[PDB]
Structure 1
Amino acid sequence: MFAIIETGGKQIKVEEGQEIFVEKLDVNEGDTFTFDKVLFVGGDSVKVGAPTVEGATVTATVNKQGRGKKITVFTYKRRKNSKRKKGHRQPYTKLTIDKINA
């Protein structure tokens, strides 16, 4: 019913049919991405992957490759005439789950 996948440098709890936001993947819009590294399967029968579950794939369809909300990074030092200002937007990929395998 729920699965744990390790993608990007992070771990995410997922369920059949929900939307997730991860660090950028090399994929185009429309395509189907499949995740390998599955760590936990929370179904009727529970599978624990201490390393991996050995099988255990999660399927998803890519939609909306995108770049995130912008943040201004600002720092200064008091009686010293130094300050720095710069902008950052972080990329992401948006996915919807369809399959949890085991």
Structure 2
Amino acid sequence: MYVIVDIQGQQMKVEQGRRLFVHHIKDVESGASVEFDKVLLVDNNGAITVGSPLVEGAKVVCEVLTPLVKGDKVLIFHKKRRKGYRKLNGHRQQFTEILVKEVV
């Protein structure tokens, strides 16, 4: 089976043992568990359950792997030609690595 669930404002396909990268979760340590009860569609080999608001009974439980994973560095450049204005900053996005255990 696979499911679509809204984890941290993002809808993802989830299967048992996937190691998904999601937006950074605050106040977690490696090995902690997290629940996600926002299943929109369930597709277990032939029969589809479409959630109107939600599937209402489906959820996924994940084991946190890495509390803090940093995305690649992106250079943010602003410039207005012939005016002298110029600035350059660096950005890294923050993620959390989770391993899906059960698709209950």
The correspondence for 2:91, drawn from 64, 80, 88, is 88
How many Å separate the matches in 2 of 1:34 and 1:9? 14
Matched, 1:12 2:50: no
Residue of structure 1 equivalent to 2:38: 37
Deviations 1:24-76 (A, max 9, x none): 11321111111111111110332211111111110111011222211111121
Normalised by the length of structure 1, the TM-score is 0.91
Following TM superposition, the consecutive aligned residue runs of length 4 or more in structure 1 with deviations greater than 4 angstroms are none
The correspondence for 1:52, drawn from 47, 51, 54, is 54
| Structure 2, unaligned runs of 5 or more | none
Q: Percent identical across equivalent pairs? A: 39
Residue of structure 2 equivalent to 1:22: 22
How many Å separate the matches in 1 of 2:10 and 2:17? 20
How many Å separate the matches in 2 of 1:42 and 1:80? 57
| Structure 1, unaligned runs of 5 or more | none
Where do 1:62-81 residues align within 5 Å? 62-65=64-67, 66-81=69-84
How many Å separate the matches in 2 of 1:7 and 1:63? 16
Residue of structure 1 equivalent to 2:103: 100
Count of residue pairs the alignment pairs up: 101
**Aligned AA (1:23):** H
Normalised by the length of structure 2, the TM-score is 0.89
